[model samples]
Target chain A: RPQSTLRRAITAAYRRPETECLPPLVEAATQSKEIRDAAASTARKLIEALRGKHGEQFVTGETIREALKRSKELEEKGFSYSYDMLGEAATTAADAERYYRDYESAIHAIGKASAGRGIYEGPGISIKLSALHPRYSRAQAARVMGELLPRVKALALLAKNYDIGLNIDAEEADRLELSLDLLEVLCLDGDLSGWNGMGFVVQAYGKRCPFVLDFIIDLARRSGRRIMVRLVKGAYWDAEIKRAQLDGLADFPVFTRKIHTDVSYIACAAKLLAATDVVFPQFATHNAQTLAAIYHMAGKDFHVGKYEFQCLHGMGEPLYEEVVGRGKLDRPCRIYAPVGTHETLLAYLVRRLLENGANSSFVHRINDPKVSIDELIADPVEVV
Target chain B: PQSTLRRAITAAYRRPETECLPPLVEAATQSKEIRDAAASTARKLIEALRGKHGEQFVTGETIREALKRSKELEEKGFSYSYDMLGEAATTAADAERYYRDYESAIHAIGKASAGRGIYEGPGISIKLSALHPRYSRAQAARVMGELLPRVKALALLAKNYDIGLNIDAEEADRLELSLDLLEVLCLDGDLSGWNGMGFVVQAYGKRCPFVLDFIIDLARRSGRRIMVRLVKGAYWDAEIKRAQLDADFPVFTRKIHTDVSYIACAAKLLAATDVVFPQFATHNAQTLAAIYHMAGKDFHVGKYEFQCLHGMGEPLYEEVVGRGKLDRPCRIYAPVGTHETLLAYLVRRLLENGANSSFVHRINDPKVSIDELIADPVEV
Candidate 1:
């Protein structure tokens, strides 16, 4: 009816109700390599076009030397990072060893970059259990314990020796539990006991997050080590939904609705802050409502070690400018800086776009001017 | 404290939930005058409700009694779907009692339907919640094993005499899980070979279009043309609270949004006419006309049909049913029950239709304009 850009019209039609017809079209696209390639190519071009100057300098430079040079502004910006060596799951032992060396090298470089500021304030390494073992699924539980535990411990000990943090990233529901079991063993190890940086991520969207937090807090009390827990709303929203339906489970381990997840995020935040002495809570989000609620709820008792907020490296800039430093809230934020080659970067982005990109998600909806400021910061409890 | 005899209405709804009756019985002498006034208010108010809704929406209190009203409507060239009323099912015995009542209605309806075709015949509406004590997705395993057999029995029996059996939709959570049970029932060899099985979809729901997609595919696979009724849905008020309490309301919040979703789902259903018989259920004159025109000039015995709720719908559909007008066959959703169970179902209807935005409420008001009703929801 009116003049609009082809981009806007295309997107409008895409979001329109008649787009319900796209499921069968999506199936048709699955049969065509050229169609998939065109979409992938356009997506890559779009991101490269959309990426800004700050992103150009800080796109997790492929080499360790370049990453360090690019990340010199971290302390000045009052940000910390756990540089994740982004790669796919290992299918071969050779692949496992390759991933291991990258993590090992990343830790060595990030450790020196720390310059004795210590674990919470300095840089670290983020890694997956599957990256260290080829046969690392629940069905191969014994091999995961027998072979995988020592590989993860080797990286943990290396991080400890350099006096920096090393975080174990999350996977599937069952595999995530296996990762926790491995973390418990590393925590009780006499050699690793003195170090306070045996960190792990707990997805707050998981219905079992509260229980898992309790179990880790008890582990912290047992080992007398402060376990750094990264509290992030899960990126596996779409994945877990399909998994649960396929498994014929009673309900999703993850919350089905967005507000329920937001409320769950806020609920998990309180559970972490209440047990602050034994556990160091890392609240990671791009949602303003979640950030404000956690900020105000924690009161004016701000300190360096009490608790911190986190966001993705490039995406959280506009929001976190108001989050960190003396002129702002004087709080700290850690960047989940993914460091890898363009080969891995493409896969990293496509997967992130598939997983974290949804209409209801904060990052996806934040640009929608129809979403007012009040709508952004409305309390999840009240929204519920 | 609430006065004695004040909370008697809420008392029967939930005892463990809250309220009292006997202590008020003990102090029955305390406020004889107040008690008389309460009775007067209740009597006049309820009679006015029943007097308005009685013959129109509810046909009768019993199946035998309901058959009389059903036949009267049948004489007017209209079909009817007989729905029984008994809502509470906290216990298996209550569910069993409802199951027996439902089975009885089917037998009674089947004998009367005799050999009329599926499109032109009378049928029974089965509420899945009544056949089992726990009807929910969380209890889906139990529902499949326990509720499915009972549901299959009723449909199988209804099939014996060419009677249509509609599996009525329930609350938000039960939507997809019901489809799971629906798929299982459809594929059953015993339940197969019959085109009389029917399903209902609520266009108010966010999942409406997607659910129709699956249902259409299921219909094609089963090799049976399932009858699908589209309605604006009941329970908007209750669902609003439920979503807030637990918290996406599976249903849409805006009325116009539901109107848009309805037409979209209607189009999808119409597109799958080879596998499904689409029954358009609405009381709104504008919606009826929207679908009637969308169906467009296809005037055969069963190309597509229209539907109306019994009491509030007759004035609109009287002009719809005969060949002289729209030349469309319309079915009536008639609730059959007596005072014991009928009062609660009747109360729910009053609440449902009493809303200011509701067509029932707006049409009843002299102030609402016809042009306001005629405005396309898409444009609105």
Candidate 2:
């Protein structure tokens, strides 16, 4: 009712468009002169607060050495790492080449650090196909194969020689099939024929995860390649959903229900574990229940080298600590870390905060002391 | 996880477009011969299911038959808002035929009413697309020039009979055209103190709040009371698919998003009693409860009303009028047509009901828990 003034205000506030900076709110509020001065001052303070969390909490560093230093700390803590160079889909040829140079330099620095470490796999690095070419899409698949494949091949060969784990990261749903085709080309290439550390990430939230998993497994089985598979709950979920709704697709390419995705994650995890002959399963999640479910399903004789659990660098610390703490599971937990300068950090940081702030996320709910542990650990299948 | 047999069976029996018919049970059943044979059998089964006793379609072949169905609803303390089932007018002649059909139906209703008020019982639901083939926002100048005059004629006829003529909501792309037409009718047409001109607003549209604001503003400017039928929305699947190719989505992605928007707009409309007379149309129990509570103790029965489709939500409406409840009459939106149009209407109904997140699907399925199904729809 209108009688509840506070509730009404909250609803109004909730309906306001989400802002990254204070200028929008201040500009809107300054419709009158009386409040202009006060609103502008307040907006400045709000912008400062928004920019407060940076560096280690989100963007790892501005340089390769700084990124490697952070990775070493995680390594000391019994956690492995996969560092992503934070950037967007390259919009021009110049931007694409610039990103390529940055990625190559980061790879050399990371590979050099782990060279004398003896027998240990080099620190993993993620490559965005879009970064290697401005027009990386199905419509330009021929150009991507001609222009993009050569550069990625150079990086893959270097990684193969240095024994680095190179993973082609996930992107928009429309690019899923194209990425798979690219992955096939990479695997079939004779240059990196015996590279066991070449990896690809699959988002469990996609409705086509089952089919994609089967395709990857079949490809690996047929080619006799030992491929690394990183199973994630998906990053571009809101984008994918909104894109589908805006585009007017026949059916959503991703599930809308949170429970459905949680169910999909477990199902995919089971399939990945069962295909250990061809797949080196890397389960990436912050949810404790999913971590426990995968660990239990792997059985007591689970080989630590066969599969590992992964969480984001800054987030999920408490959950992973509990899982890998003293006398605990003693399992290896890899950290998916991203590094970038502040100039390139805005979009990446925003996405990280959004993922952490989602209500259904363990990274979000774990911070709320009022949320019961049992509720956090409940089986999603039963809940569904 | 070991219960693979149960999972397999559940997956096999998952929804296959038609929830009313028995699902084809075989895992590998996809031959043209078998499918065509099954289609013939299923068609007959659907006809029987959608017959007189079914809650899927209202059956009536003639005007007398239509009135009989309306009387039955009236006897149960319900009013009906009916449509003369037909497609949008494709040609000028087709448009005139449909117009005459509406004119005849209303004339019949007027004669049967015996001089009752427009709000006494039944009303006519109109589709603007039926008045002109080029009735669209893109050709707004032409629509305003040609379509407005024809609609004015219908408005004049409805005024003569003292019957409510409600304009139904259609696709998202035509929202602006509908609003423009509504503006002309409310301001420039011969709708004086009639207060019988209504407009249907679909809550699934992302612009619902803005549309509601526009209506209230239009009403205040014209100083005429307009009836609004607030629906949670139909045509969601089509809207979603249509949005994929567009730059921006005109509707909500999730059903809960629409439900929340529906309630929020309802609260605003119920409070704006100065300009609007709301018709809260829904079958969801939670939505009903929300409207009822928001109306509060000083609520008058005739101040606002609840509505549902004729063949659906019978027991819920019965409870609303029965024993210690609001005890007010609710409107039923009934479609009247022959068997030809019934198939299309039935398919639309099935699609609406069989959607994974639809209330009907949740209520009918035994798998969803009550707490999960009836939880407060998320606020946008």
Candidate 3:
């Protein structure tokens, strides 16, 4: 059976003890020659593995043009692209300005490549608020509102002119509410009016995910715009978990358990799929069961324009391969293609690795030979 | 007026310029006249703050002296819970020394117990961190392995002498870990017979009600009626600072949120009369009035009691303590130590009370109205 073969692959991957504890050991190696040589070999092996194999798996290329090349390939394979210009949070005005300029150039390049394909059919750009301003925070609300909002508005206006989607990426839990204020203002803005391409990402793991979707739908309806919303399981789980504990908060803003997040994702999907009139729901996941469930839930009245599926490039692509083709499920899947140099991409790459490396994660557990297909999809709705 | 007072106190505490510029550094090249002027202002402020809290709050320099103050207060119908002022033990030596200090203090308090028992008599409060170095959630092995014995030893000693012993609460991280140790102590065949094992829970914590649920059930399952002292909270700033790890803090962020949590937990504690001896520790009169009324008019020796920091709660508790007024028994949470570490310890607590949000600080201000003091946190 396919299940037995998949289980073997999962077991084989889990059994291997590859290498590396790392920097602390490098410091500790000074204790002995034996340790020193061992450290040297392990360090070289780690560097060799990451320097080559790890880079192309998550990141498309160093340049935006190379990203477009991959986007074309994905488009032909019954998929599209969402250009995510990977970078750290800007720490200085110089950095923010440089990031802003890079974004300005990229949108032009991306839109030019999109070539009047329109918002849904064309490749989109995922932008970080942190990249546009050094002080992208609630504590610096006045400064961000004054400085950051205009930069975002200018970008949104350009996005409208180009007819390609511009989605404000999900950020730290504290900044979610602040992003909404910016979102509401952007939606109501006279300059950016009548554009249906305006978008926001919601992390399903968040405590307020359903409520956020509620507000986004209302915002879309009230503003008279068909807003696009991407539903993600969530990155920044480590930071969110740590932040709550450190801050002495009684409970986390996000789910503490993987099953909790799974249910939340499923529940959030049900909301998004139902609200497709006002909001163009883009469900992002790698789980075979979740995809299959959403497929049935979306009903037989299938249209590429109704809703879409998304998976991160390289990591979850295999699942989407079977999902997109007409011979298969005939759904549209978008590749979240992250484009950046090695320096900027390492953090993004590590997050992808961290999420997938977590054994409970669907993308990680989908191959488990021992797990039945039934158990894999077993109604997580009752988890609450 | 309360808003203005809050603003002034908040501003005063955030005196960044003074904090950034040390007096000695500023006065280094200045003339003798300027130096003395600076010294005079600093000296008076220190003396004023210290004397008010240090002398008034601290019962004594030693166990005997504190007992003398305890006896004096007992005559006025105030039982005491002596909190020994010492730093958290950072070494095995320090932990051992603290253990000895506690061992001695218990004997002293117990001898003086004179059959007054847990409710009517004085109790000894001990910090687990003081009794054991490496007291934390991660150090569960060290805490339960080494620290558990020391606590069990003290519990037995207190049980023999017929006095109360309370385990003081620390930060939010240690909440469950402390409960783990408490669970072991509660269920142990050696200690199962005594109800003197007391635990302190912070009402400011969001998990306070849920934790009480576990603790009450724990008491029932173990068949030991735990003496639980419920306070608003300590470690407010530490909890706030901890959340800066880009995480949410484990305690309530707002004053009213804590007050609401306090009353809610208070209701649970009131309902759990069989499993727990609830000691309501609060300085706020509104909390006092609400809990006092909610407690119902049924007066007994140990059904429930009110507690407050000794000198800080004197006037307000005066009306609460006597048979003529609320007729409730109010326990004095007294601090006992030498002037050296005691003043530093006294100053730390006083600083908390000095905050504008503190009930004690606002009560000291004449600008505060009775209505303002008595406003229900649930409504406001």
Candidate 4:
């Protein structure tokens, strides 16, 4: 019954024309003043609808704080946190500055609030450099990064100075090069030290990320810096394809199937856990099978202390707590979150809604709590 | 001596260097002379012991018994290395025993076809000391003449019986003598790998790299296929101590790790050497990994044999064979007899595995829980 409801929810969320490839006229209109204005209006309307559905409260800093607080509660049960102040590629430098300021405020607050505890020092923040400027120009992006790099560095330094860590989130391939560059610059400037001060997120959803991780590992080894990696099943399948179609590129590396992405991520996670010198990995998953698999693999390794479990702040709290509560034998668990103003924050909320919409279980659980797909979404502690 | 011995044990224990002991270097340096003296004393002691115990050391009867047992083994998917036992002998009777035992083993193994596959146990190993006793080079050659006919006959018998032979080495003082005897066995007897004639070279011996190069050179020049066995030096401390105690300006600038590493290097060398067959004589992890990875299941080394001592771990044998990496069967070097007589052989073998036997971990390890006697009283 849970599965059937999950299937129905998935069908309902994905069946609409919401993420459709724009028509030729609409595509032309993206460049037109009037059409561009209308498109922005349409995006606004969509967020309002989601706000009505999920409650405007879900789109606020209070909600973000609630998510972070829930994570702390999970931490009390054994979960740690990797905070995500999610917003990307703003239309203006002003917007990028706003995103940066929001993240800086959160970093300062997290350090003041939760220092010197858990598996890590800082409430890790995974930031996308593209979010710092519009159209994602590297020059403009680097300028934005130039401003934020020092702040994140100081916070990271604050964490290190207080011994905290930060995760620089990976992004779309087009933006990945610049994003990674900014990450390197921030890390180099911040003088991120110690075992878990810096982490990188890799999506095994694409074929190339495994290679990307190889580059990262080689870089870490060469630089004599310890690295933590946050691994995930990717969230940009539809956006990637639509963008590729609009840009007329082949989208050669995008994963074609959900199972393919899931299986790849699982296999890659296994490979990471197998390595001896690798520092703690941030395993971000809500699936029981994956959680169980990573747990056993990590446990069997002679070097199990160097790994941890991470998940979104609002979700998988039960799993986060269960693993953390397993005494010292358990890997650390982290919860990721973000906070900003209504407009920027609302865009993030919609993305979250989109992710949740695609989750299928999120919708199904709203109606029927008994769904088995709900099991995939449950924390390990809450399983019974 | 205890401190130096302890240092070697400690280093062996702390592999991959998790810890350091400061006393190790100084003690090894202090005992260098003693180690040399011990090696020479042990070699002389071996000769004295063989003379005193030639009747026990000689494998004439053991060879006959092994042939009889080998016949039974051939039927149940097993093979053997029938080595003529008494080495470092002081008398011709010792060489006579070697000659007679090797001849009998050759004849018995080659007659396997006459007795049917059930009686086909015909592989034997022989040390140079038996063919050419260390005392008189001329007397040794004469003794070798005694064994040459049967060696050739065994090569002929191999067409019918599937018999294989390997010539073993001696101490540093007589390594050249061993090589001379091996060349004579190969050339004069016309016995070769194609005809199941093989010679073993310890990669541990000081001149082994050059000797190996010579074997490859001889193979190419003679256009005759050779089968070489690569062993990490068995009498490492013995050789080292001999050189140092005699104050002979020891030319061997190497260690046990060097020899072990070279044994693996010889495997790569053998791959390119075009030897008809090469036996990987080892029980080491790195060697096993190399053979498993480099050779793959292709590239015939012509009856790949993994030779380890008897009364040792069978789990490794089972695992290596079970993994299906090599087509050649595992040939155990079993010494079957009463405990008293076999004590010296056992000690020599334990010494062969080194002072604290590298295989000690197999016995002491709690994780390896397989029963120790699955194949005892197992027949030829």
lDDT score of model 3?
0.72
lDDT per residue (tens digit) for residues A1-384 in model 1: 211242233333322332232232223212134433333343233222223222122356777667777666865789887788876557568988999898888888988888877888888778877778874652377877888888888999999998898888877665766787788889999989689888989986666666677778877888898999998888766667656664686556666667766666767777788888998999888775577667765667889888888877776655666678997668898887887754445435543554333557765555554665445555555545
lDDT of 4 by residue, A192-300 (tens): 6453567778776555554555555555665556677788866566557645654565433456555445555555665576553744567777554456555654544
iRMS, candidate 3, in Å: value is 22.0
TM-score of each: 0.45, 0.46, 0.46, 0.38
3 versus 4: better DockQ goes to: 3
Off by over 4 Å in 3: A1-55, A382-384, B1-380
The CAPRI class of candidate 3 is: incorrect
- The positional error of residue B268 in candidate 3, measured at the CA in angstroms, is 62
What CAPRI class is candidate 2? Answer: incorrect
The candidate 1 chain A region of ten consecutive residues with least summed lDDT is A22-31
Specify the poorest-scoring 10-residue window by lDDT in model 2 chain B: B20-29
Residue B228 displacement (Å), model 3: 47
Per-residue accuracy of model 3 over B1-380 as CA lDDT, tens digit each: 23432333233222332231232122212344433343443333223333454467788868888898677668778899887766556578888887888888999888888778888888888888787765642466656778888999999988887788998888776775677788889988887577888999997675666667777878888898898999988677557655563444567677776777787777788888888999999877767766766666676988989998867777767666777756788888878875544533544464466566787776656676545665556546
Candidate 4 chain B weakest lDDT stretch, 10 residues:
B371-380
Which runs in model 4 stand beyond 4 Å of their true positions?
A1-72, A118-122, A137-155, A185-190, A193-195, A301-305, A327-329, A359-384, B1-380
Error of 4 at A82 (Å): 2.7
Which one wins by lDDT: 2 or 4? Answer: 2
